[PDB]
Amino acid sequence: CKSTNSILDSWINIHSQAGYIHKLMSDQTYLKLINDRLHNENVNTNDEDG
Amino acid sequence: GESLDRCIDDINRAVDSMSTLYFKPPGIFHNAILQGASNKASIRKDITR
Amino acid sequence: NTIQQLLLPKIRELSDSIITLDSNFTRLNFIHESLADLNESLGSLLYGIMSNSWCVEFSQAPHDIQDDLIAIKQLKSLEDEKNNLVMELSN
Helix, strand or coil: CHHHHHHHHHHHHHHHHHHHHHHHHHCHHHHHHHHHHHHHHHHCCCCCCC | CHHHHHHHHHHHHHHHHHHHCCCCCCCHHHHHHHHHCCCHHHHHHHHHC | CHHHHHHHHHHHHHHHHHHHHHHHHHHHHHHHHHHHHHHHHHHHHHHHHHHHHCCCCCCCCCCCHHHHHHHHHHHHHHHHHHHHHHHHHHC
């Protein structure tokens, strides 16, 4: 029973992280920001502060 | 009386059946997961294994 | 005679309780086997998932996800503020 519980808490952790990052991927603004961040790093990787 | 003998026989049968029970040991994957999540050094040891 | 009779009921209820306990333990053994099978299936799935995780790279995994989400909701709120402010101005 204890081992089953441990497996289930591992599943719980996985699904919690899945939900958080799904919330992240839900917002279009953050994805746009990381997209032009990728393009900026393509043109200039130095300006991380930008 | 014979009721005492019957009760004793039933109890003996119940005990004999109770002894013969076998509970399944953990399988192959439970070991991997549990020993890879058991202790901080155990996670590293299981990853190496 | 009557005194062994005085005893015999007690051994009788003891026998009944022992038989019930035996049956309960057999049912518990069935439940135990079911739990073992479920553990094995779920553990196999988790092991496959973790083996693939130790084998693949995702290039955009965040690191301060809590900070990211609080920043996202803060920006969302500031956007509702901007929208109210602009539609009042236009009105």
